[PDB]
Amino acid sequence: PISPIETVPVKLKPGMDGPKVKQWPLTEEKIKALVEICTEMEKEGKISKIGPENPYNTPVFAIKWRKLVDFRELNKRTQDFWEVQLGIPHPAGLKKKKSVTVLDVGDAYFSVPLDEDFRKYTAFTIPSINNETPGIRYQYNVLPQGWKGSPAIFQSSMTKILEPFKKQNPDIVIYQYMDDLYVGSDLEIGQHRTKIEELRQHLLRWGLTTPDKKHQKEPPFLWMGYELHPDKWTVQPIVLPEKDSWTVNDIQKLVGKLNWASQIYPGIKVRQLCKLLRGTKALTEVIPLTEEAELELAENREILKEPVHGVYYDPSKDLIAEIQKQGQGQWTYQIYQEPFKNLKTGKYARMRGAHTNDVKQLTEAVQKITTESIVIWGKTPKFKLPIQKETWETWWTEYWQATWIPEWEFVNTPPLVKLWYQLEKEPIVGAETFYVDGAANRETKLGKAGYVTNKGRQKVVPLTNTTNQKTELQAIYLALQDSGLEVNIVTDSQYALGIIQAQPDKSESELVNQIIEQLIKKEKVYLAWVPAHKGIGGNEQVDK
Amino acid sequence: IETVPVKLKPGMDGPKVKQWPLTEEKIKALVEICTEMEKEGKISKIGPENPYNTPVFAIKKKWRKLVDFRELNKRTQDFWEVQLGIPHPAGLKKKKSVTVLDVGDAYFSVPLDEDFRKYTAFTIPSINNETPGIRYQYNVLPQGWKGSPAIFQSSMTKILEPFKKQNPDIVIYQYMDDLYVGSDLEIGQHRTKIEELRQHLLRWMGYELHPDKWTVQPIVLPEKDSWTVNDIQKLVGKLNWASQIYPGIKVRQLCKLTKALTEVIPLTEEAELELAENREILKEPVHGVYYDPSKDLIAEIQKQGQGQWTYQIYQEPFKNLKTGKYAHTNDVKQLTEAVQKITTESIVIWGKTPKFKLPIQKETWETWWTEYWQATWIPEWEFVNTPPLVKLWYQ
Ligand SMILES: O=C1c2ccccc2C(=O)N1CCOC(=S)Nc1ccc(I)cc1
């Protein structure tokens, strides 16, 4: 049918006019297909024979028999609409329903009225057996298939018309996705089916027809890669058949499928499989599966052995989020309300920063979970972290950046997060003082990294092909080597001070990683800063 | 009735900013708000033919709707600033007492240029995107739009005309939604003039500010009385940085005083002559720094630990127009308050808000900033990696 819903005022962009592109004559048959089709549509009221001469026109053609109008031109000249793509519910955010049904709308776009003042713009011509006679002119009376306002105006229409029934049945839940309606409820089958015919009948009063008893309804639903039961949810079934050869293409898809599953499958690992992709990779090259990964694939297969489903959300219960340190850079977490009955699973493994330490990462994870929990449940979870509340406040307090975790509490699931060393806050007494510095020719791309002492010593390992910065972490490094378990170092490089002064415990820099391990063996280290080329006792001597 | 033609800067297009996810509790409070507002004709539902959006939040101060017109404002500046800009009196900052009155709730009288309403569109989201999301537009002067006071000046001036005349020594300044009214009257007297003013407003105390009593945050040097290499090293360290501000600082004599770090050493009689004068400077105002009304204001904040926070305001890196400090509290809660305080003072002083550089993670700030916010404006902000020594040189 055609809904009587009032239309949406459509307009062309600021100073642009209707489109006017000419028709690439078609073939005998395609012409015949177009005529049959239009005639029917024409009978349905979906279109109208346009008289005089609408100077406007958009190409039309047939594909095998169906008709496709080319709408680019009209599109580009058409206004912008409120985005229909803002987000899609996560299943773990859904409340539990007793009965679910899915009615699909037939001929949606075609069942919704286009704005009459705009109809004139959608004019097209079915050619004559070869550019001889004018041709049958047609404009649209309803949302055309390829048009840009159709998805928007439709979604707005379906809502306005769905509003009254919702209001007379607030206890009921209805979700619109494209050409479908998911209806859920806590009514018992018998009474639920009544409630649906009541909907279909309300929906027919508004021009929208639905499946009689064909209701695709009746769970295991497939929506956006999910499988949906009224009581539980899980990700769509995924297989990983045997293979002795893996192409970039293959392991691409595998990584993707793994990542998607890790949404409800606890302990999904893809770190080792991600490496194999490192480097400029042709999609068809076979990549030998390394050892660290060899096992990872089957241990993945293992946890995917028996299916797993997540539960739904109970608005009258706190959320519990707990996180697990898993390998280096990798983090994992679960979210539940009743111990170990998960709502959703997830992991976090990134960097974005050059230098970092577990305590920072843990906080980032909590942060990501915090905003994920907001968008989904509209409230914040209670945390359980593998960090002593003390070891958190220390860092919390001393650090120069602000932070604020929601309510949390300690949980002893090793490995535990901790600082791997603590720089002295005051100069060490009776321990070698090391005035260190670096240099480098910006042209020769080489430099000298050295140091001098309050005890006469002196060095200078020459370095080849290093920037002006390395020869500063190199120096500090050199000093942490020739010194005893207890020391204090003087730099003129704030670059190095900042790095080391934030208690890194891991970095994407082989030099920094060395300085790290070294810092962990000492029993006292003090790093002070003094201005460069300011001839300060000690620094100057090493500058020479 | 009579609408003031509002035109978006020639060329520029409406704002199209996405709505931030909100908590269930705030969402609920927004609908109840937005239900009353349309019931009394202040806002209207809109359709998909409107591709515009501005974010909304809920604050307490009893919930209150708060729209973030940061973007709309940046795209209409010509209107509110060079078209109908309000002049800022230098006297305000000099008065003993300044009271901040919330007068926003009066823009709802004047209607907005129909042709301009579609740019004021906002969205009330829904938990987990289970429902489309309720769309609105204003059909009257919105509270957070710099255009409102601009348009609302004729009414404002008429309202004040009498009060001013009877009180020609009272400075009244308007900046978005707020009136700043200061005087040199004694405590109680001032408060009586405010109440006597509130009544004028009616026919169409609260926030005690004391600007006149604001002074520089002097960079201080340790007093000590023994001094060590490390000590003197740090001592010159900040004296170096200070060199880049406060023309005259001389670290030469100090810097002329290999050697262990923990080795105590007695300064030179000539030494005191240095940090003495250097001390006399730093306490005195900077020489050569002037506010430039055409340049935007920057503000850096550093975390001093112990609920302490230092801050500087400048238009050019290192040349400071002003520096100061600020004392269930958390990092983000204290920082939010700091940002609010610094901004009030900026407005009182220059009639504009500074652009903030925040020592925090973008997501962390974005997640929580709303929780403790109370002002009805929102300054521009950026996120930075607090330089280790910069924090120390302002301790
Ligand atoms: O019915 C849906 C539905 C189906 C698929 C995807 C998203 C969706 C939705 O938001 N809604 C509305 C809310 O549904 C709620 S609260 N609970 C449900 C709905 C459907 C099912 I199967 C299980 C649980």
UniProtKB/Swiss-Prot annotation, chain B:
Mg(2+) 1 binds at D102, D177, D178. Changing D102A: 5- to 12-fold decrease in affinity for dTTP substrates. Strongly decreased RNA-directed and DNA-directed DNA polymerase activities. No effect on RNase H activity. Loss of pyrophosphorolysis (reverse of the polymerase reaction). Changing I159V: 70% loss of DNA-directed DNA polymerase activity. 64% loss of RNA-directed DNA polymerase activity. Changing D177N: Strongly decreased RNA-directed and DNA-directed DNA polymerase activities. No effect on RNase H activity. Changing W377L: No effect on RT p66/p51 heterodimerization. Changing S148A: 74% loss of polymerase activity. 56% loss of RNase H activity. Changing K61E: Strong decrease in RT binding affinity for all dNTP substrates and in catalytic efficiency. 100-fold decreased sensitivity to ddNTP inhibitors. Changing S148G: Complete loss of polymerase activity. No loss of RNase H activity. Changing G206A: Complete loss of RNA-dependent DNA polymerase activity. Complete loss of RNA 5'-end and 3'-end cleavages. Changing W145Y: 58% loss of DNA-directed DNA polymerase activity. 42% loss of RNA-directed DNA polymerase activity. This is p51 RT. The lineage of its organism: Viruses, Riboviria, Pararnavirae, Artverviricota, Revtraviricetes. The gene is gag-pol. The chain holds residues 604 to 1027 of 1447 of the full protein.
